[PDB]
Amino acid sequence: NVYADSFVIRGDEVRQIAPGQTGKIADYNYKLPDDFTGCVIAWNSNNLD
Amino acid sequence: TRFASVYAWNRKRISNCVADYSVLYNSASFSTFKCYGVSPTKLNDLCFT
Numbered sequence A: 001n002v003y004a005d006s007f008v009i010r011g012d013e014v015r016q017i018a019p020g021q022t023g024k025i026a027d028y029n030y031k032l033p034d035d036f037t038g039c040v041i042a043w044n045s046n047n048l049d
Numbered sequence B: 001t002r003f004a005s006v007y008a009w010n011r012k013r014i015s016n017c018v019a020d021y022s023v024l025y026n027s028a029s030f031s032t033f034k035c036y037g038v039s040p041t042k043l044n045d046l047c048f049t
């Protein structure tokens, strides 16, 4: 059951995309479960955005 | 305004206050934040000595 979720954030908030993290993004915007099975991918897009 | 040098680092005591770090969500962004003997998601329900 494959799903792909996409969005944009700033550079130093990429560390908050993990199962057990706290902060502005992990609290009010996007949270991952503790029993997560998947992969997390990010890359710089300073040219486009 | 000005921080100390690494060889002569500083140290101050914190006591008699309430730890509410949500007030930092609009002023400061941290590239590094790691905790060791506790979980980041449990800091809201504890008391410190």
Ligand SMILES: CCCCC/C=C\C/C=C\CCCCCCCC(=O)O
Pocket (backbone or CB within 6 Å): A022, A023, A024, B014, B019, B021, B024, B030, B033, B043, B048
């Ligand atoms: C100088 C006051 C010290 C605070 C009182 C001491 C301990 C309180 C408990 C944990 C420290 C809070 C970390 C704040 C930075 C995390 C911000 C974030 O969520 O990204």
